[PDB]
């Protein structure tokens, strides 16, 4: 597997002109999936990471925006990265997006990290674009290869024992961090329970404790749930993604939680910015923002 060749071809389109595809070979992509899978399984399902690093939220196949995020933040390994999931579906270039991310994981496995989002899940792919993209540009066997890799992604990260990171949010079933550690891979995303909630739940200003989620799955959680969680586990911040936010980032619960969303002008249906969070050596947080067009 020639990682540098692959990365070079993926980066060739920098400076376009969003639209131009990068079409790797089927064998190359299979290799990216198999090798990255191995690395994911070799590392904990609950990552323990060090600052400084950059944290990114949803990308959703907006490949040319991913390239802008790296241009702003430094291409790996110039900065360490943690992505919070939702690499595929909705956008025009999910394949380029996930392939560059997997290539970087293989090249820089101790300095580049990818968590699982609710879209790194076959039943959601089937509906929201990635299955169709794979069928059109490759074949459904390659889609299954991707799913097999997704099924091995880690689920959460803690940065320097103080910033708890996950795609969706908290769970009414999350009492101990060991519950996350015990989760065996490969696994699908279940339609209920801890793993589901970590990838699906949302904060809500109008809910006291736990509430119904209008997505039809998981829950919403209020500010007091966040406060209690941070106190119980001696954390300073929850960092999550999963919801489009106008500024690209948005604080909740007296700045005890932040939502990151990194795909600007999402679906061409929102006028949102995309943000990446810079976490310095002392865990101070700042932002790099792709303003809407």
Partner 1 sequence: XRXXX
The binder of 243, among partner 1, Cl ion, Mn ion, none, by C-beta within 5 to 8 A per type, is: partner 1
Stretch that binds Cl ion, among 51-59, 88-96, 143-151, 158-166 (CB under 5 A): 88-96
- Residue 233 is assigned to a ligand binding site: no
Stretch that binds partner 1, among 8-16, 40-48, 261-269, 284-292 (CB under 8 A): 261-269
Binding residues for Mn ion restricted to 83-122, rule: CB under 5 A: 86, 117-118
For residue 281, give the DSSP letter: T
- Residue 231 is assigned to a ligand binding site: no
Query: Which of 21, 192, 232, 291 contacts Cl ion by CB under 5 A?
Result: 192
Residues 6+ away with beta carbon under 8 Å from 235: 158, 161, 162, 163, 164, 229
The residues that bridge with 278 in the sheet, in sequence order, are 54, 286
For residue 132, give the DSSP letter: H
For the bound state, the minimum distance from the C-beta of residue 291 to Cl ion, rounded and expressed in Å, comes to: 17
The two tokens of residue 285 are 């947080």
Under rule CB under 8 A, residue 206 binds partner 1: no
Stretch that binds Cl ion, among 22-30, 71-79, 99-107, 188-196 (CB under 5 A): 188-196
Which parts of 173-259 fold into alpha helices (H)?
Answer: 177-181, 194-200, 223-233
> Active-site residue 231, yes or no?
no
Q: Which residue has the tokens 């090798």?
A: 35
**What whole-number distance in Å separates Cα of residue 249 and Cα of residue 239?**
10
- Residue 60 is assigned to a ligand binding site: yes
Nearer to partner 1, 77 or 268 (CB): 268
- Measure CA 138 to chain center: 24
Under rule CB under 8 A, residue 13 binds partner 1: no
- Residue 204 is assigned to a ligand binding site: no
**Burial (CB count within 10 angstroms: exposed 0-12, middle 13-18, buried 19+), residue 199:** buried
Angle ∠(200,175,282) on CA atoms, nearest 5: 80
Among residues 101, 119, 240, 253, the one annotated as catalytic is: 119
The binder of 128, among partner 1, Cl ion, Mn ion, none, by C-beta within 5 to 8 A per type, is: partner 1
> Which is nearest to 242 in space by CA: 63, 92, 116?
116
> Which is nearest to 218 in space by CA: 204, 229, 232, 228?
204
Instruction: Give the footprint of Mn ion on this chain (CB under 5 A).
Output: 58, 86, 117-118, 242
Binding-site residues for Mn(2+), in ranges, read: 58, 60, 86, 118, 167, 242
Instruction: Give the footprint of Cl ion on this chain (CB under 5 A).
Output: 62, 91-92, 132-133, 136, 192, 196-197, 218
């Amino acid at each position: 597997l020639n990682l540098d060749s692959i990365i070079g071809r993926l980066l060739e389109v920098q400076g376009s002109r969003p639209g131009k595809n990068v079409q790797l070979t089927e064998n190359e992509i299979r290799g990216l999936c198999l090798k990255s899978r191995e690395i994911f399984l070799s590392q904990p399902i609950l990552l323990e990471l060090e600052a400084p690093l950059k944290i990114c939220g949803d990308i959703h196949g907006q490949y040319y925006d991913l390239l802008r995020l790296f241009e702003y933040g430094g291409f790996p390994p110039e900065s360490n990265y943690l992505f919070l999931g939702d690499y595929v579906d909705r956008g025009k270039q999910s394949l380029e997006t996930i392939c560059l991310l997997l290539a970087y994981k293989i090249k820089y496995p101790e300095n580049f990290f990818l968590l699982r989002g609710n879209h790194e899940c076959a039943s959601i792919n089937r509906i929201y674009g990635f299955y169709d993209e794979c069928k059109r540009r490759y074949n459904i066997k390659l889609w299954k290869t991707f799913t097999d890799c997704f099924n091995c992604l880690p689920i959460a990260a803690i940065v320097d024992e103080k910033i708890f990171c996950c795609h969706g949010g908290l769970s009414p079933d999350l009492q101990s961090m060991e519950q996350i550690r015990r989760i065996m891979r490969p696994t699908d995303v279940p339609d209920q329970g801890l793993l589901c909630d970590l990838l699906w739940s949302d904060p809500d200003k109008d809910v006291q404790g736990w509430g119904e989620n209008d997505r039809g799955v998981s829950f919403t959680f209020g500010a007091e749930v966040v406060a209690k969680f941070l106190h119980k586990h001696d954390l300073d911040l929850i960092c999550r993604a999963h919801q489009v936010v106008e500024d690209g980032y948005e604080f909740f619960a007296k700045r005890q939680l932040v939502t990151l969303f990194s795909a600007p002008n999402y679906c061409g249906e929102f006028d949102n910015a995309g943000a990446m969070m810079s976490v310095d050596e002392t865990l101070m947080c700042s932002f790099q923002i792709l303003k809407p067009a």
